[PDB]
Design an enzyme around this catalytic site. Structure first.
Site, PDB file in Angstrom:
ATOM      1  N   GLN A   1      -5.548 -17.694  -3.841  1.00 56.29           N
ATOM      2  CA  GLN A   1      -5.605 -16.861  -5.074  1.00 56.29           C
ATOM      3  C   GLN A   1      -6.764 -17.338  -5.959  1.00 56.29           C
ATOM      4  OE1 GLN A   1      -3.956 -13.886  -6.192  1.00 56.29           O
ATOM      5  NE2 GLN A   1      -3.931 -13.836  -3.957  1.00 56.29           N
TER       6      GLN A   1
ATOM      7  N   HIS B   1      -5.886   7.437  -3.190  1.00 55.28           N
ATOM      8  CA  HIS B   1      -6.934   6.517  -2.655  1.00 55.28           C
ATOM      9  C   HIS B   1      -6.400   5.703  -1.481  1.00 55.28           C
ATOM     10  CE1 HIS B   1      -5.080   3.191  -4.694  1.00 55.28           C
ATOM     11  NE2 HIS B   1      -5.879   2.370  -4.015  1.00 55.28           N
ATOM     12  N   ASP B   2      -5.087   5.611  -1.291  1.00 52.83           N
ATOM     13  CA  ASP B   2      -4.541   4.847  -0.129  1.00 52.83           C
ATOM     14  C   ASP B   2      -3.622   5.740   0.721  1.00 52.83           C
ATOM     15  OD1 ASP B   2      -5.703   2.254   0.083  1.00 52.83           O
ATOM     16  OD2 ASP B   2      -4.502   1.483  -1.555  1.00 52.83           O
TER      17      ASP B   2
ATOM     18  N   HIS C   1       0.833  -1.224   0.000  1.00 50.17           N
ATOM     19  CA  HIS C   1       0.000   0.000   0.000  1.00 50.17           C
ATOM     20  C   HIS C   1       0.860   1.265   0.000  1.00 50.17           C
ATOM     21  CE1 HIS C   1      -3.376  -2.806   1.062  1.00 50.17           C
ATOM     22  NE2 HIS C   1      -3.838  -2.120   0.008  1.00 50.17           N
TER      23      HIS C   1
ATOM     24  N   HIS D   1       1.913   1.576  -5.797  1.00 51.14           N
ATOM     25  CA  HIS D   1       0.513   1.110  -5.886  1.00 51.14           C
ATOM     26  C   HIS D   1      -0.349   2.266  -6.366  1.00 51.14           C
ATOM     27  CE1 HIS D   1      -3.234  -0.848  -4.975  1.00 51.14           C
ATOM     28  NE2 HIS D   1      -3.546   0.033  -4.032  1.00 51.14           N
TER      29      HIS D   1
ATOM     30  N   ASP E   1      -7.975  -0.841  -8.504  1.00 50.48           N
ATOM     31  CA  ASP E   1      -7.344  -1.255  -7.237  1.00 50.48           C
ATOM     32  C   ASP E   1      -6.837  -2.689  -7.379  1.00 50.48           C
ATOM     33  OD1 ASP E   1      -6.510  -0.705  -4.650  1.00 50.48           O
ATOM     34  OD2 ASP E   1      -8.497  -1.090  -3.768  1.00 50.48           O
TER      35      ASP E   1
HETATM   36  C1  LIG Z   1      -4.262 -10.330  -5.629  1.00 52.50           C
HETATM   37  C2  LIG Z   1      -4.985  -9.576  -4.562  1.00 52.50           C
HETATM   38  N1  LIG Z   1      -5.388  -8.346  -4.767  1.00 52.50           N
HETATM   39  C3  LIG Z   1      -6.067  -7.680  -3.827  1.00 52.50           C
HETATM   40  C4  LIG Z   1      -6.400  -8.263  -2.651  1.00 52.50           C
HETATM   41  C5  LIG Z   1      -7.171  -7.507  -1.578  1.00 52.50           C
HETATM   42  N2  LIG Z   1      -6.020  -9.555  -2.474  1.00 52.50           N
HETATM   43  N3  LIG Z   1      -6.216 -10.442  -1.436  1.00 52.50           N
HETATM   44  C6  LIG Z   1      -5.536 -11.531  -1.690  1.00 52.50           C
HETATM   45  C7  LIG Z   1      -5.603 -12.611  -0.712  1.00 52.50           C
HETATM   46  C8  LIG Z   1      -6.136 -13.826  -1.355  1.00 52.50           C
HETATM   47  C9  LIG Z   1      -6.511 -14.889  -0.390  1.00 52.50           C
HETATM   48  N4  LIG Z   1      -5.564 -15.683   0.000  1.00 52.50           N
HETATM   49  C10 LIG Z   1      -6.107 -16.534   0.853  1.00 52.50           C
HETATM   50  N5  LIG Z   1      -5.469 -17.577   1.379  1.00 52.50           N
HETATM   51  C11 LIG Z   1      -4.046 -17.500   1.530  1.00 52.50           C
HETATM   52  C12 LIG Z   1      -3.987 -18.947   1.809  1.00 52.50           C
HETATM   53  C13 LIG Z   1      -4.831 -19.012   3.034  1.00 52.50           C
HETATM   54  C14 LIG Z   1      -5.405 -20.404   3.215  1.00 52.50           C
HETATM   55  C15 LIG Z   1      -5.989 -18.049   2.645  1.00 52.50           C
HETATM   56  N6  LIG Z   1      -7.359 -16.348   1.048  1.00 52.50           N
HETATM   57  N7  LIG Z   1      -7.693 -15.277   0.210  1.00 52.50           N
HETATM   58  C16 LIG Z   1      -9.052 -14.832  -0.005  1.00 52.50           C
HETATM   59  N8  LIG Z   1      -4.992 -11.473  -2.916  1.00 52.50           N
HETATM   60  C17 LIG Z   1      -5.253 -10.237  -3.388  1.00 52.50           C
HETATM   61 MG   LIG Z   2      -7.404   0.933   0.297  1.00 50.68          MG
HETATM   62 ZN   LIG Z   3      -5.398   0.528  -3.124  1.00 47.83          ZN
END
Ligand SMILES: Cc1ncc(C)n2nc(CCc3nc(N4CC[C@H](C)C4)nn3C)nc12
Ligand SMILES: [Mg+2]
Ligand SMILES: [Zn+2]
Length: 312
Positions: A268, A105-106, A67, A71, A216
């Site tokens: 992911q 924005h951040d 952030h 970004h 974003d």
């Molecule tokens: C690429 C991107 N862009 C923006 C945002 C906000 N995010 N958030 C992530 C986190 C993704 C995620 N990883 C996990 N895993 C990790 C393994 C664990 C079991 C849970 N759960 N979730 C939902 N990737 C991004």
């Molecule tokens: Mg934000």
């Molecule tokens: Zn942002």
């Protein structure tokens, strides 16, 4: 008069949705001015005021892994791409307000979710019960605008000025991903029941809200190695927050637990499926020329699928 030109490779590639602003921090300001001059005009802003605003906005981003300033400018380039491919859908004020909203924005992000301020009992969680950081980001944007020599909007009338700050406020709030889910659902229904109306101000708002989520998230719409390496910065923050969660005696969600490193590929997948694909799917329906973002998101989902199958 004095335009910014970029080197040839950057002059061509900056128009593409999948452009990466590169590792040279000193060019990011000129990349942003280049983007205002072409998407808005060389008359949108006084060059001395804009350059001073940009440098104070930069000063107020923190040296956190994700952030950060990089970004901010990355999120403004994706907005620029969207505006330049949807030329005549947007008002003069929207073109002015949205690239600034993205840069700002951040502002002053600490690398912690709204949820970690709520559980730390940070003061900002008392001042702003919902969209804690997003309300701080808008507030910080307003502070920089009121500094001597920084009112880039000085040429606007009272109600033109109130309009652009209201655009910037909504646009910044909309980057609260807790608000994305419902915003996209209402947009998807309005589109399918054909009742979606770009003259309805509270429709434009939702459409700008989705564009903001899209810019974003644009890490997922890049060339795969950009996507793979941005992913590492995103998790570096989350896992640091997870550590801070454990310091308060709270088990972080899996997303923020660095002990669950190896499940990242599956995390992911969930994310592209639950969040990114629906965002670009809906946004491409609402704005046909944004299709390349959906295409690139799909491509990167397939790359994560390959990581799980041990083909990568
Ligand atoms: C690429 C991107 N862009 C923006 C945002 C906000 N995010 N958030 C992530 C986190 C993704 C995620 N990883 C996990 N895993 C990790 C393994 C664990 C079991 C849970 N759960 N979730 C939902 N990737 C991004
Ligand atoms: Mg934000
Ligand atoms: Zn942002």
């Amino acid at each position: 008069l004095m335009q910014f030109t970029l080197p040839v490779r950057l002059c061509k590639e900056i128009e593409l949705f999948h452009f990466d602003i590169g590792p040279f921090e000193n060019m990011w300001p000129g990349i942003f001015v280049y983007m205002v001059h072409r998407s808005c005009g060389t008359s949108c802003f006084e060059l001395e005021k804009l350059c001073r605003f940009i440098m104070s906005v930069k000063k107020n981003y923190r040296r956190v892994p994700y952030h950060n300033w990089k970004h901010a400018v990355t999120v403004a380039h994706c907005m620029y791409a969207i505006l330049q491919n949807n030329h005549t859908l947007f008002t003069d004020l929207e073109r002015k307000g949205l690239l600034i909203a993205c840069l700002c924005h951040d502002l002053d992000h600490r690398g912690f979710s709204n949820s970690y301020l709520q559980k730390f009992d940070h003061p900002l969680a008392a001042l702003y019960s919902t969209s804690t950081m997003e309300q701080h980001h808008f507030s910080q944007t307003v502070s920089i605008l009121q500094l001597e020599g920084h009112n880039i909007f000085s040429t606007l009338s009272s109600s033109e000025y109130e309009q652009v700050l209201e655009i910037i406020r909504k646009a910044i709030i909309a980057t609260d991903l807790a608000l994305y889910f419902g915003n996209r659902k209402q947009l998807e229904e309005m589109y399918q029941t054909g009742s979606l109306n770009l003259n309805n101000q509270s429709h434009r708002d939702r459409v700008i809200g989705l564009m903001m989520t899209a810019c974003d998230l644009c890490s997922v719409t890049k060339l795969w190695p950009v996507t793979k390496l941005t992913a590492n910065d995103i998790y570096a923050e989350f896992w640091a927050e997870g550590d801070e969660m454990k310091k308060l005696g709270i088990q972080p969600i899996p997303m923020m637990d660095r002990d669950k490193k190896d499940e990242v590929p599956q995390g992911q997948l969930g994310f592209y499926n639950a969040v990114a694909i629906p965002c670009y799917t809906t946004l491409t329906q609402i704005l046909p020329p944004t299709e390349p973002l959906l295409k690139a998101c799909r491509d990167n989902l397939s790359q994560w699928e390959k990581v799980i199958r041990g083909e990568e």
